[model samples]
Target: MTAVQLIVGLGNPGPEYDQTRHNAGALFVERLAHAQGVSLVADRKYFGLVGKFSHQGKDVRLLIPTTYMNRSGQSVAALAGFFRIAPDAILVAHDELDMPPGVAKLKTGGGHGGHNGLRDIIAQLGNQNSFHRLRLGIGHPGHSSLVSGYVLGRAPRSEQELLDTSIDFALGVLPEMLAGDWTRAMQKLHSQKA
Candidate 1:
């Protein structure tokens, strides 16, 4: 009933990293889970906060990695491996620097595009890139060198508002996407503006 068995949110752990631009992806998924009344619980073996709920007769699992950004793959690989979930059955939500804030895109099977979380996931998954990605736009820093500081910082009030709106738009398509309707999901989210 579903193409995606698991949805993973990428980010670093600790309250210190909370609300930072780099943690937007994690925030997005947390909101998604909360909206469904699914409470995530810390799971050491999974290296993440895990939640599960059934949608349209299919069990869908949500994960927010507790590992640092670069080591996120360890958490992802653990849960995915345990469930025997194929790479294609996973959808990873993460911050996207190439796009402006308030934009979201659904894509599949590509290089990590220099995203450390994605890079590690691919490497740990035996170099597979077939998993889906929900790119949550966070806007880019002007220069490469400034990226670290920018992403690790909090978004200004205006930008944070837009980011919240975009996450909502993406959330609007959750059920359809879980049921394998990627085309409609993209149409709804991609057509919207902040």
Candidate 2:
């Protein structure tokens, strides 16, 4: 009953943010679209690029907001409202500062945790925070002041590879997620760290 109808990857717009730590969620959705053999196209109404695919006879859509990170809610709200997808039926992928690179986690109904994308999304959604979140760990910089620079920059080869590994793991367990089997998906995804 908890199946997700929409998958959103949060990030800033433009080439400058590509492959940067801040775009981890957006990159994952792009990778997911590639795997699904779908291409995302800019959708003005949605305020993002959108891709559609069928899974187990259910229609699902992926969104990558063209809006900047802090303004992500505009994209999510538009689409979710149009499709009538409930807040619980949407999954948002975003970078997680609490965990290190190479790790990812699934959670729901929490505060934004200083994530601007999430902050705006929550606000735009009228403080309804029950939507699911796929937290792709980007780790924390040594100091809080360095956070902006760190997230906006690309990681070194080793760290980048680790993040990729986490993405791969997430992809492998996606079916379980889509099937609403959160326990299975979480168990398999959390089982390994690369």
Candidate 3:
């Protein structure tokens, strides 16, 4: 009923993935590490960045799975199993194509939106919608031909500025989320725009 002790951010790996639209989850987690003064350099194994911190009087472990989008769930499931954290106590942050850029929402249990990352996570966790997810909008590509190019593309100058602000906003919302304030955090983060 309170803030969960484990947080996961879904994204692809490699320098090529940085700044791409699909890396929004990584960006948000990096912002969170900056805000908390926690180092994201824990380890590169088990798929992504792993860091530990204390929030709301509880020890918390943050993970950014590095197994590429399609295998994210495997890494997440491994960490969860090692930590004995249940699906209900895990919070996942990922980019959403259905939502426009700069918007965020908190919800529990839902479809994967055709996201391979979420799909893998669901597959590994054996749950359709049992975990908490922080959805960050990355907007949709207008044309089918542009789907891959768009998600892999860098943000425009204006959207770049917006992304900076959005990262800060996401960092602020994360702790509130860890404090068992999901509704308030969603209210404060969802409408925020640069």
155 Cα displacement, candidate 1 (Å): 0.8
Clashes of 1: 0
Q: Which stretches of candidate 3 lie over 4 Å from their true place?
A: 42-45
Q: Write the residue-wise lDDT of candidate 1 on 72-117 in tens digits.
A: 8888899999999989889999999999999989998898999999
Candidate 2 per-residue C-alpha lDDT over 36-97 given as tens digits, one digit per residue, 9 for 90 to 100: 89999989999999999888788899999999999999999999888888899889999999
Off by over 4 Å in 2: none
- CA displacement after TM-score superposition, residue 66 of candidate 2 (Å): 0.1
The best-first sequence of candidates by lDDT reads 2, 1, 3
For candidate 3, report its TM-score.
0.90
TM-score per candidate, chains pooled:
0.97, 0.97, 0.90
**C-alpha local distance difference test of each model:** 0.90, 0.91, 0.78
Error of 3 at 44 (Å): 5.7
Q: Which clashing pairs does model 2 show?
A: none
Q: Among these predicted structures, which one has the highest lDDT? A: 2
lDDT tens readout by residue for model 3, 54-96: 8667789888887878999888888888778878788888887
